[PDB]
Design a protein around this ligand. Structure first.
Ligand code: FAD
Ligand code: FAD
Ligand code: A1I3U
Ligand code: BR
Ligand code: BR
Ligand code: BR
Ligand code: BR
Lengths: 487, 489
């Protein structure tokens, strides 16, 4: 048995920020628990968290790899010549390079623990034994052997989320993004199930690395993918994915999956349609990872959707027990989890309470081409404000008229409170959009108005200067109804 | 044949002149004439309708840098598993130039159609000069004795003729070219010397390096010790290293003394130091000077500054009440979006009853080197002269994807310079892929007087290079009454 100021269950984005800050900034004694020291099967996430091991970091490397399919083709318009029939995409090399980069990060976190006073790492499965006792066991089974018993003044729940799998016959013949990161071969025919960012991003990855004759299909149960993003951009990215050979099946949903004699999968949709693929990747959602924590031993309250309930300062209903990150089922983003962990420790162990601001958070989708966004979409703004203006610019950049990818329209939209010009949201689609949007997030913390953008001098030639060239609204929402002119 | 009369006559149909002319005609209903020497790009006069940026400037050079970037993309793709016949790769310069020419000509034609269509906005072809306070003469050539094509009466006259490459007076200067000719070379040079340490020399060095034929070599020379004066010093040193790492030879503290032709027709350059270099093309990019000579400004008494630009006040007014000047002719910041801003402000002031002056501080700009620069605001040595305590926040590292691509020399640099007394951000300086795109919204931030805490409180977008700007809370070092030091005393 060992005594600690803070015990953190989950060595992830938020948990590591909280633990490191508690130990090095405030001199506290910190223990952090995770189930695996490095990435991959059997538990996939590990020391460093989901983003490091099976999330943002490896997927961004794989999207970068997939972008070379476009670069090799597009180089021709600028005079580059080579033998196109010799091009091939080696998925094994990609996965090996990705594996080496993730493992390097795993090892560096190991050394961080070894090198930092008052910051200890424990391997195993943590759960709540009592209000001030965290127990670490060998497996997720609550009857497996006890490895440690950790007394704690404060307990932080930071176990993240896990892929949601629908209750359909044959769901056991499907995979999630966890397994996609380790496929021995690139699938020739693949169905990605879901309309959200993970399904869209992997669709682009598989599309570039598929062997000859391959086909990527994405299905989504409603009418338009990427719910929660700007509607113009949802339509345009649909169009540009299709232009690059991905088939988008909307208003369709798998009803069952069965095994074929050759090892492929036979998917039957609710509509009666069928599709044979080598791999079915379910990406319909991610759910808080609460079941192994034994929250019933202490009475930590969950919300109806399954997150741990928290106030604005990440406090549960049980004194001295806190939760941050994906387990609170709010914004599932790594920098938000980091921010929450830092605010929590500043509040508990420092002299100043701090709460995370969950509005105006910039984020991205690494689709091909990608999305960058910050703030409100226009239909959410129209329910909160009487007069909303939308400024819109959409065109194919000159370079893609030369590259031959004329379908690659760049979209830039600014949403304002028209009563005073305040910028409520900015939404971008096109090369560079995730990089352009970061400083827009800073603008929204300075109560920037549309005139502040238009009066700034542009950098030329860029896509970003479009944001400083919009003077006149394209249309409006008045009392919630869309219209081209004001009344 | 009768002279024609206008509210405003613009000499030069470029970045600033077209903005002023279009806004005067379409926003305020004024009658406008605009004069330029050529209706589409290229020899003999190079610039034309649309200006220097459209014809032999930002627009074509960015397309050519984009073309040059594919040399890096093709090599870097292997680390991510891409395989193809490397021996078959060829860079076809003629196809690049043909594609660029067709793009620029399309812009030329669209501007031509704007004038043919738009009420109160007329274009006149020829050389404009000042005859008197209210008369612009349009002649067939730059020679003031050449034939008169038109006389344009004007209540207000806007000088917007831009700038021109400067050529040093050395023996053999006739064997050298400028950036104007570089845009039209029939074949890519095997060996080329670019002379100058500024952005045009650096950018063209990158272009020639990608399209050079087998066994070629690009050399850049600069007369002082470190290229890219005026930019952040950490970035100046890193750009030098990363150009060198991509095979460009950088000769600093060197300057051509003379050029002669070898018997085979190549250029033999002798430097002041006595070093020699044999190249196929010498491109001079040592500076650009305002185009005032042909305007006959003596006829009306428009004052020039010692340096040679048209003298203007904050509202672009010359010493002659109804004559104005904007853009490169004022010999200040030579950027297309500054000329456009000045032209819009002038027209709002003169015809719009809403006075406004251009802010020449905190202007974001870029260098499309490979990899590129994005910057806005003060460099730290300048800030240290104006502020008692200056803080510098700095992040520099090779991004993970270039540890896989093999281009490990590609360190991304992000620096924020502050007034440490109150946290105000004085400048932001970036080197690396995406830097020109990242810096645009930084310019909006600085115009809103952002402090370092506004950057740090903003939640990052992950994974990006840009999020480094929102993760810096502790200064790397300081300047205290001008003195650099790791810690405050
Ligand atoms: C494919 C994919 C791509 C993504 N891309 C992005 C992106 O580009 N940008 C972005 O911002 N976000 C992205 N995310 C989301 C991001 O990964 C999460 O928001 C973030 O990792 C959550 O941080 P956290 O601290 O809540 O938990 P995590 O980082 O998930 O860490 C939780 C840790 O808890 C451990 N654990 C779980 N249960 C126990 C237990 N009982 N005992 C001990 N340890 C336990 C796990 O092994 C894991 O390491 C992506 C997610 C996925 C799945
Ligand atoms: C190689 C190069 C690259 C550049 N890259 C960039 C970049 O990336 N970004 C950026 O912001 N800036 C860039 N610039 C600078 C930009 O081109 C200028 O700042 C901008 O064009 C200046 O606009 P202006 O209105 O002053 O003049 P210009 O745009 O030069 O227009 C002046 C016009 O006047 C005409 N003219 C001249 N004399 C007469 C006369 N007597 N009668 C009639 N017409 C006349 C000319 O033909 C010309 O069309 C670059 C410049 C060069 C040379
Ligand atoms: C995945 C998704 O629906 N997103 C859109 C809304 C974003 C936000 N800041 O609320 C987060 C990303
Ligand atoms: Br779905
Ligand atoms: Br929908
Ligand atoms: Br060629
Ligand atoms: Br701060």
């Amino acid at each position: 048995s060992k005594a600690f100021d803070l015990v953190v269950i989950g060595a992830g984005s938020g948990g590591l920020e909280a633990g490191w800050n508690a130990a090095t900034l405030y001199g506290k004694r910190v223990a952090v628990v995770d189930v695996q020291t490095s990435h991959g099967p059997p538990f996939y996430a590990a020391l460093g968290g989901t983003c490091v091991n099976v999330g943002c970091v490896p997927k961004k490397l794989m999207v970068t790899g997939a972008q070379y399919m476009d670069h090799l083709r597009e180089s021709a318009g600028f005079g580059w010549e080579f033998d196109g029939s010799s091009v091939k995409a080696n998925w094994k090399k990609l996965i090996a390079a990705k594996n080496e980069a993730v493992l390097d990060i795993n090892k560096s976190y190991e050394g961080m623990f070894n090198d930092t006073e008052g910051l200890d790492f424990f391997l195993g499965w943590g759960s709540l034994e009592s209000k001030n006792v965290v127990v670490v066991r060998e497996t997720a089974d609550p009857k497996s052997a006890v490895k440690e018993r950790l007394q704690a003044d404060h307990i932080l729940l930071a176990t993240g989320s896990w892929p949601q799998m629908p209750a359909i016959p044959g769901i056991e013949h499907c995979i999630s993004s966890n397994e996609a990161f380790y496929l021995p071969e690139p699938p020739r025919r693949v169905l990605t199930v879901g309309g959200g960012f993970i399904s869209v991003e992997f669709a682009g990855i598989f599309n570039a690395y598929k062997p000859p004759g391959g086909k990527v299909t994405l299905c989504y149960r409603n009418n338009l993918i990427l719910r929660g993003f700007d509607e113009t951009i949802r339509e345009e990215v649909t169009k540009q994915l299709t232009a690059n050979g991905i088939e988008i099946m909307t208003n369709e949903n798998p009803a069952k999956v069965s095994l074929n004699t050759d090892g492929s999968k036979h998917v039957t949709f609710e509509s009666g349609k069928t599709l044979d693929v080598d791999v079915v990747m379910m990406a319909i959602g991610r759910i808080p990872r609460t079941n192994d924590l034994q929250l019933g031993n202490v009475g930590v309250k969950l919300t109806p959707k399954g997150g741990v309930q928290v106030d604005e300062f990440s406090r549960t209903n049980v004194p001295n027990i806190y939760a941050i990150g994906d387990i609170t089922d709010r914004l599932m983003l790594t920098p938000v989890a980091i921010n929450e962990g830092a605010a929590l420790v500043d509040t508990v162990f420092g002299n100043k309470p701090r709460k995370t601001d969950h509005t105006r958070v910039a984020s991205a989708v690494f689709s091909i081409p990608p999305i960058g966004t910050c703030g409100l979409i226009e239909e959410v703004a129209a329910k909160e404000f009487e007069k909303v203006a939308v400024y819109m610019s959409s065109f194919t950049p000159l370079m893609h008229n030369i590259s031959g990818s004329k379908y690659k329209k760049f979209v830039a939209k600014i949403v304002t409170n028209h009563s005073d010009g305040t910028v409520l949201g900015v939404h971008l689609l096109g090369d560079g959009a995730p990089e352009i949007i970061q400083a827009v997030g800073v603008c929204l913390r300075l109560n920037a108005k549309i005139s502040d953008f238009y009066n700034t001098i542009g950098v030329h030639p860029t896509s970003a200067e479009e944001l400083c060239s919009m003077r006149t609204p394209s249309y409006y929402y008045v009392k919630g109804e869309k219209m081209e002119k004001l009344p």
